[PDB]
């Protein structure tokens, strides 16, 4: 279905085996599926056809808001309130987008676990490593900022991480 993007939300091709009956006994599941298709699926499909016909007469569109990039807190001068405000808002929006990216990866992981079923420990290794990487990066970025998090606090955290990495690299190269 064109409702969502198959690249963002992948699913493996569905291999459904053909029925291979070996008995003369009728299949109650098949009979009940036929009854369900006659009594339920046809009325609901007719109702949806009517509603979709009514919708197509009143077609109208809504758009996705586009935000342009603005200078960030690294470029903002000290106690320059306007640039600080714009940078803080931009950082907040990026934080929201990162949260939703983590949500998408988690949805992939859950769906793969359920889909694979009894062999999920081996068949969902690709999704587990991707979730591990995404979650580790997200944690390193926004792990312990507190209730009053801000772009300045995240910048201080990143500067601390960069100092620690530089020190470790110097010690290794020593």
């Amino acid at each position: 279905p064109d409702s969502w993007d198959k690249d963002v939300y992948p699913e493996p091709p569905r291999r459904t085996p053909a029925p291979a009956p070996q008995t003369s006994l009728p299949n109650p599941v098949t009979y009940l599926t036929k009854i369900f298709d006659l009594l339920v699926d046809r009325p609901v499909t007719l109702a949806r056809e009517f509603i979709e016909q009514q919708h197509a007469k009143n077609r109208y569109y809504y758009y996705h808001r586009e935000f342009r990039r603005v200078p960030d807190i690294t470029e903002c001068e000290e106690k320059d309130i306007l640039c600080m405000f714009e940078a803080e808002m931009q950082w907040r929006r990026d934080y929201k987008v990162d949260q939703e990216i983590v949500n998408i990866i988690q949805e992939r992981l859950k769906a793969c676990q359920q889909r694979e079923g009894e062999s999920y420990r081996q068949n969902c290794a690709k999704e587990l490593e991707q979730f591990t990487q995404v979650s580790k990066a997200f944690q390193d970025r926004y792990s312990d900022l507190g209730a009053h998090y801000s772009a300045r606090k995240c910048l201080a955290k990143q500067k601390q991480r960069m100092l620690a990495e530089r020190k470790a690299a110097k010690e290794a190269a020593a």
Binding site: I73, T74, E75, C76, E78, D144, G146, A147, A156, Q160
Partner: protein
């Protein structure tokens, strides 16, 4: 006494001549409206204390209360605005005259400023 004895101060002058160059308060100033409200409250309290009908009696008296309060509030607001303008004028002049005491500092960005990070956990 900060501004008492400021040079060129005429004693016992509620509003000097140099205050005429400032924008006078608008007659619909919220502070003037609050002064009128104080006058109205005084009128109601007068009726209540004298045991007249509070809202009805003494309409002329209530009008006089409100008018007096608005009048004095207008002049008080003019004097208050003049004093604040004078304070800002003096402060700006002193900062201009003492550059070595009020120096302009080079602005450093947050990419250059280093701040200690305190994790919350």
């Amino acid at each position: 006494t900060m501004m008492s004895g400021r040079p060129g101060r005429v004693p016992l002058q509620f509003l000097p001549n140099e205050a005429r160059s400032l924008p006078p308060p608008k007659l619909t100033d919220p502070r003037l409206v609050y002064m009128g409200f104080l006058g109205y409250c005084s009128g109601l309290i007068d009726n209540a204390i004298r045991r007249r009908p509070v809202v009805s009696a003494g309409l002329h008296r209530q009008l006089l209360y409100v008018t007096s309060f608005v009048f004095f509030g207008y002049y008080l607001l003019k004097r208050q605005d003049y004093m604040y303008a004078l304070r800002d004028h003096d402060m700006f002049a002193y900062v201009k005259s003492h550059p070595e005491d009020f120096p302009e500092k080079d602005k450093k960005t947050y990419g250059e400023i280093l701040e200690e990070f305190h994790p919350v956990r």
